[model samples]
Target: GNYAGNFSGSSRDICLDGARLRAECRRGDGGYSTSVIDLNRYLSNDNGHFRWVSTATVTVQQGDTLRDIGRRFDCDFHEIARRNNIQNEDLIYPGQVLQVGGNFWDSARDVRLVDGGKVLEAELRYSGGWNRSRIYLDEHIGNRNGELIHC
Candidate 1:
């Protein structure tokens, strides 16, 4: 029957210089529950820096497109593209290894929000005479403030 116990200790007065000491405790599970004591050590003799480490790998599946993978991982298509060095979004193929989480991955595209609320639709108009394209927002065909309004 292993149970909790009180433990204490101290270091002797030795040399005097630039020194540091720390202690920690860790718990583990036995049959139901078990306890443990661990003293981990960390030192910084000079300037300290940290870097990211890859934890997992995402493998592409059959019929798995870049957009599909992005949706699955809750990430943006452009992010996945940039992380894997994919120049073209449509050029992604099966069996491709994509780095989902790491330091190298950055930047994401804006997500489109479409709900059953007021459907704010828009149309693109191209005039041959003006030789220009214009966006027209339909503001007269949806419910506004709980009232149906026609534009």
Candidate 2:
């Protein structure tokens, strides 16, 4: 469940995201507010609900393995591989901008949530190009492009 939208403003800070954990989030409310999300970490909003935030630029450095990147960023190693479409995970190189965090999906795509955050259905309207738009209906994530997209 990754998202693809222009979620601006990310730093060394973290937020609660309806669940107090270091989910590598940027709460949509001032980068520190937990009351209501201005942006959620791994969660998204229903027209400004508790949904949370990712796709931060991480310049790969020496000794930085995929796992190493995941551990620090709160992003999963394999997911990163999928998002980047890396058939060979080991092929990553230094200075590579590996996208991390966020449950990004695809644009014009729709998903149904079951049992509070569990996905029940997923379908796409089109496998078109990435578009930066927020569609908060019942619940959803973004699509693709330079950054990842979710329903």
Candidate 3:
């Protein structure tokens, strides 16, 4: 799909990168473009549906609740719990390195496929936006649970 003319504005190329999510798009003129989304700044969905790829890791500190870690990273605490396979969301210890990442509903606009046109990441107006999800989709990377189709 080298047909670049269909792309415009913020580009439709979204995908995942290590530690950070990146986006790149081309105009119909066949030019080059790019952008990035930091996973550290956002949250994941608890249900494992339409989840973003986690590229970063964080070590939990004293008096740190899962909620606290999520707030610091802008990620969903429940999603973190699932990523780590924790049985209890309320119980976490210091010095525990939690793999913080989660899923999100493709807002029906933020993420899309070139041929199918289904949204993989929905933009959260109050949160950090859908850059991570956007970049992930563009790179041909989908959610962990194959939830993109359902989204």
Candidate 4:
């Protein structure tokens, strides 16, 4: 999955692996790219948690703005700005790390866990558009772990 957003002005820097990984999604002049890694590889087989560890690299083309990129990547522009600590959305530049997969908006919802490790539910919502919000309901049960899990 790709987390898309656009940047402008000066280049922004992001920290990954305890080092700075620059982002590259800009407008009308440069391109960007990033990589995603699988988190399951670092976990034990018995964990039984279905999780994905991925990275995304965005390349900004000419005339591409951060808002445009967010729309394309199905991300909420505000979330992107917050995650990257961007005080000014218009001040982004090429080679910046825009926090693509760690947030709910940057990823697609397909399957979810429910019923205190008993029931698995698939998402019944559409993947596109930014107005959609997630709500959870809990009916008290004997299980102490009844909670809403989104994927």
Each candidate's clash count:
1, 31, 18, 18
- Ranking of candidates on lDDT, top first: 3, 2, 4, 1
| Residue 11 Cα positional deviation in candidate 2, in Å, after optimal superposition | 27
Residue 5's lDDT in candidate 2: 33
How many clashing pairs in candidate 3? 18
**Candidate 1 backbone collisions, by pair:** 140-151
Each model's lDDT comes to 0.32, 0.42, 0.49, 0.35
Q: For model 4, what is the error of residue 10's alpha carbon versus the real structure, in angstroms, after optimal superposition?
A: 50
Range of the 10 consecutive residues with the lowest summed lDDT in candidate 1: 38-47
Write down the lDDT that model 2 would get: 0.42
Cα lDDT for residue 76, model 1?
50
Question: Candidate 2 at residue 64, lDDT?
Answer: 85
Local error of candidate 2 at 31, Å?
24
* Residue range 39-123, candidate 1, lDDT tens digits: 1011100101111122245789788888887667544566567657999888877788887632321111111112221111112
Better of 2 and 3 by TM-score: 3
Top candidate (TM-score): 3
lDDT of 4: 0.35
Q: Write one digit per residue (lDDT tens) for candidate 4, span 1-151.
A: 3212212122223212211122332333444333222221211111122222233546656566678877776554565566578898877776665654332322323333343322323332222432322222111111112211212
3 against 4, candidate with superior TM-score: 3
